[PDB]
Structure formats: C-alpha cells, structure tokens
C-alpha cells in the first residue's frame, strides 16, 4: 500500500521587518541640492600598430577558408574580436594572413556570403583626418557618419561604414594572397 501525503505548500517565511515611520525626508533623501551628472570621455587616439602589417608571404588554407575570389582567400574568424584587436587576431589565425579592407571589386562577394543579422570588421581605417586606407593601400569612399577611425560591413553594405564604438564584438574578414 502507498502512504498518503499532504498538499505541497510554500515554505514558511518570516514576518515583515518593523517599518521606520519616524524618519525625516532629510534622512530618507539626500542633500536636496543636486547637480546634474556629467561625464568626461577619456578620448584616446588611434595609431597603426606598425608591427602588424600586410604579410608579404603568400598562402591559402583550402581546408577552412570562407570563400575565394581572384587570388584572394577570405576567412571569417570564428571568435568575435574588437576592431582594433583584430590586426593580431588574424596574424595568428592562419599563416600569412592579415586584416583586409575590401575594395568595391571584392565588396559584393563579401556581402553575398553573409546572413541578414551579423556584421563584420573590415580593414579600412583612417589615422589622420582623411584618406581612408587599408593594409594594402589606396583610398576608400567610406560612408563616414560617426567618429571614423574604424569601419565595418553588413549584408546590405555597398561601402565600408564607420562604426561609433569599435570596442564591440564582431568577426573580421581576413585575406591570404598570392
């Protein structure tokens, strides 16, 4: 035979604490005189790492490359990285690959191999106050609307687009040459 059991009830709790009804507003609140909060942004300047540059070596990983176009083999890094921190994140991915800035010729093929929700860090950048360049050189007609310094692309991107805060987490496109 089975043994009956009572209905499951909530575990007992303690009575509420004694309410402090004898406290003044100057005790419950602050100094009444308030100063509206302001923030000083610790703006840092962007510099090219110099030691990280285009690999004059030539390679291509056929096993795990994302897609090929002309003599370029492109990988989308599995781990997400910061835009500035990705220069290294591809100097260690595969041998002889680096952070690449897509040109108008390679750009549609990049945007084609992309879902509608994710984005990618690209190798277009500006150091001074103009002339957007990449690790290969040349100029880019970047759709600049934010503080510049960095760029990214999405599925419906026609030109590298500048990002506001480039400490985010996005994959990066990287190239290997011949």
């Amino acid at each position: 035979t089975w043994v009956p059991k009572p209905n499951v009830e909530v575990w007992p709790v303690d009575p509420p604490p004694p309410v402090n009804f004898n406290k003044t507003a100057e005790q419950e609140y602050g100094d009444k005189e308030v100063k509206l909060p302001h923030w000083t942004p610790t703006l840092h300047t962007f510099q090219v790492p110099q030691n990280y540059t285009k690999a004059n070596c030539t390679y291509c990983n056929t096993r795990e490359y994302t897609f090929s176009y002309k003599g370029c083999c492109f990988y989308f890094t599995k781990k997400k990285h910061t835009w500035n921190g990705c220069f290294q994140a591809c100097a260690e991915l595969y041998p002889c690959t680096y952070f690449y800035g897509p040109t108008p010729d390679i750009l549609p093929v990049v945007t084609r191999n992309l879902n509608a929700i994710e984005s990618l860090w690209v190798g277009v950048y500006r150091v001074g106050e103009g002339n957007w360049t990449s690790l290969d050189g040349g100029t880019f007609k970047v759709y600049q609307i934010f503080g510049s310094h960095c760029t990214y692309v999405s599925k419906f991107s026609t030109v590298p687009v500048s990002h506001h805060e480039c400490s985010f987490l996005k994959p990066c496109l990287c190239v290997s040459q011949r």
């Epitope: 030539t58 291509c60 096993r63 090929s68 002309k70 011949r178």
Partner: antibody, heavy 118, light 112 residues
Amino acid sequence: EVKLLESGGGLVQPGGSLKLSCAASGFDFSRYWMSWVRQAPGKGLEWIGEINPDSSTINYTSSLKDKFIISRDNAKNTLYLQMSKVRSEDTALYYCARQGDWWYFDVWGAGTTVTVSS
Amino acid sequence: DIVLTQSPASLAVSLGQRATISCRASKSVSTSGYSYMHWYQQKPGQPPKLLIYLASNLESGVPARFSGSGSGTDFTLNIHPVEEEDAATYYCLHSRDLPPTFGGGTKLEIKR
C-alpha cells in the same frame, strides 16, 4: 585518398583540337586550385597552367599563353584543357594536379598521353 | 622565371645508407621565413608522389626517412636509411613566383 583520373586521349594531327577532361572524386572540387602540367619523355615535368576554384581567373605560362585554354566546371567536378595549333613540341603525358596550401601539387592524376603524329 | 638545378643527376647508394640530393634556385624562393621548395618522387609508370612540402614538412603517409631541408637558395633532401622500392626519380619544385618550374631530376640507384 583523393582520386584524379584523366580522359583516355588518343592521337591528333598537327593543327588539331582535342578536349581533355580530368575528373575528380573523394573531395570537394570547387574549393581547390587546379593545375595542368606536362611531362615529355626526355624533357622532364613542365607546368603549363593553373586556375583558381570557382573564381575562374586562369594563369598560363609564357610559351603556352594563347595556345592552351583551361576551363572548370564544379557542377560536373571536372577540369578541362583545350588544345589549339599543336606542334611536335608538346607531345607528352599531361597531368592534372590539385594544388594544396602554398600551392604544391598535392594530388596528381593518372595522366593522358598526347601525340601529334600525322 | 626561376631555374632549379639539381646537383646530383645520378646517385648510387648502398641499401641502408644515407642518400642526399641538392637543389639550387636562381633567385631566393624564401619569403617572410617560408621557403617555397617542395620535393616530389616519380616512380616509372606512376604519377609523381608528394614527398616533402615546403622546406622541411613531411607529407602524411610518407616514412620519416624522407627529410627535406634548406633555405634561401639552397635546399637538400636526405634519406638516412635508404631502402628497396625507394629507387625512383626525384624532383625539386618551387612555388615562390607565379610560374612553378621543376628541377632537372635525380635517379636513385641501390648498391646491392
């Protein structure tokens, strides 16, 4: 494990044409660079051309710039070589090779003999 | 182009001893520390077999006796314990520039 076999090419006469199909199996064909090389008895091995996967940007050697045409078809998983204005210099065993990383010929084919005797 | 010159056109080595082949490039095939110089073996009646890729890397499926080495413009291929069936033709190949040229070749003989 990778299997590359060329078509049984026979005999052509000078100035003729013969399409050369090299079929692949055991791996993805649309990801690797392909190459056409030749070996003549008493000359050694000599690279004649290469082609990138899908992107279709082909590069030949100098002596065979306008002489050969290399095409690809990943839907059929076959590499194509086409001859034109043949002469007694390119009678040899043709090999279709599959380039690996750093583009060494990772996998070779069985080979197809080509002769231009009247 | 780049011309490859194999120093030993012919070489006879007793079975179990060391065989050494040399290859010299016209200009340097080594860039950024990587030496684009591979070693292939062709058996008569068979397609060429990939022995060594890059300067020293042994391709999977090849006995450890096959050992490539070298840098810059001078490369070597060593077979410390040569064996029967190892007797074939040996070529060196470069992939530095666009047109890859093979070597002159080297035929190995077993002193039995």
